[PDB]
Design a protein around this ligand. Sequence first.
Ligand SMILES: N[C@@H](CCC(=O)N[C@@H](CS[C@]1(SCCCCCCO)CC=C([N+](=O)[O-])c2nonc21)C(=O)NCC(=O)O)C(=O)O
Ligand SMILES: N[C@@H](CCC(=O)N[C@@H](CS)C(=O)NCC(=O)O)C(=O)O
Lengths: 216, 217
Amino acid sequence: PMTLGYWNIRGLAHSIRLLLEYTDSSYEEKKYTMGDAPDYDRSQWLNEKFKLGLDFPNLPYLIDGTHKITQSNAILRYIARKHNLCGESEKEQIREDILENQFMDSRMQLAKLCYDPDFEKLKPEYLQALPEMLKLYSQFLGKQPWFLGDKITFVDFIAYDVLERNQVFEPSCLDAFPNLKDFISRFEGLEKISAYMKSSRFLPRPVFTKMAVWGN
Amino acid sequence: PMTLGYWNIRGLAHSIRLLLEYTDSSYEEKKYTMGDAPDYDRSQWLNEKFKLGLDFPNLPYLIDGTHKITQSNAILRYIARKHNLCGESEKEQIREDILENQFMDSRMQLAKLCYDPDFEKLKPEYLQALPEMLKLYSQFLGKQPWFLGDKITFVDFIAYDVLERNQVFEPSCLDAFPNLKDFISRFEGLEKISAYMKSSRFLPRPVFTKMAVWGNK
Ligand SMILES: N[C@@H](CCC(=O)N[C@@H](CS[C@]1(SCCCCCCO)CC=C([N+](=O)[O-])c2nonc21)C(=O)NCC(=O)O)C(=O)O
Ligand SMILES: N[C@@H](CCC(=O)N[C@@H](CS)C(=O)NCC(=O)O)C(=O)O
């Protein structure tokens, strides 16, 4: 089987792990443990980092035969293409590309906050902006069952992760956006996803690394 | 014409303007000016931001007919598909994806440095790590003329922007990597590109916005 390498946390492997399960992929997981503070020892990853045949050694990584991939977006697009889970038409491709980068931007803004020493001082400034962030997403989904329309594709897995981790951060953040809330239930309702969240494989905790002020 | 909206700098628009030029695209530019410090008045952009019909108002943006795009990678990929400037085989697509994301990480790393008030003290750590970063790109390019092999694709335009601006940052950084500088020459030697670079539409400076410590100016 193929190998997914990540920290033993949720992080950037969440949507990947979900997609792998949705896709009925045969995979094992290489889980890396990071040291405590103050050092945050990374040595378990580091003995190994340049010895796996990765062009740009990074985490997450996926090995699949002669295919050795880093960058979370690339791993997603790789598994996605294998199972016809991408935007098919031109218009769908545009939305795919905009969403993948937007959600990445949203993901980073949350991490930026949760890793900064000034968490508490900067927290309210993020919560100010969050409704307006999600509003944009909600309008874009509209009445669609999925972000690219009638077809579920990979951006949905990125969407779920980003949306749901905001819900863990601010529990009522989606309440003002029914379509977003429905998207969570809909995605969590999918036969192979809810099977996997009912299993021992599943890992929603912790969100970030031991380095993070929030969710570590 | 298409409209490309961005700050009046290099920034995230470099690869885009170069790709528009290589592809003979008809385009017009809406350039926004940021105010001077300490406050960096953004009104020019901010009073127009939600009146352009964009799903996620942002800079850069492209208006092409009905098509309204933000996010620099989305814009690039949009122009690229029009002219068959994408990876074709699965291997090409994997490499294209890895690089687009990898280059963005490099890009942000330089940005994080140059926007930090502790620039001076932080500079040398970036310089120490730079050869390792450039080496990885050099090993990836190998004896290939472009990053996906035999033909140019949109990822070469990203590559060019990120590699070159590091040459602007440390002019000696590419010396140990002949393939990397040959890549730079080869790109700039492209007919439509040198013509563009000799024109007055060429905007190599300033690299970043007025908020930056390095390249602001
Ligand atoms: N990442 C997405 C969107 C990119 C994006 O964030 N957009 C910026 C213009 S990006 C800018 S200049 C600084 C921005 C000034 C305001 C703060 C930005 O929020 C350009 C280039 C950088 N570079 O080449 O390394 C750099 N590093 O840091 N800033 C930069 C912006 O002004 N947004 C309009 C708004 O917020 O209303 C993309 O790929 O398009
Ligand atoms: N932006 C990349 C990078 C992810 C990244 O920064 N990796 C972290 C974990 S989230 C890491 O531990 N990297 C390994 C390293 O630096 O050695 C991606 O999306 O996959």
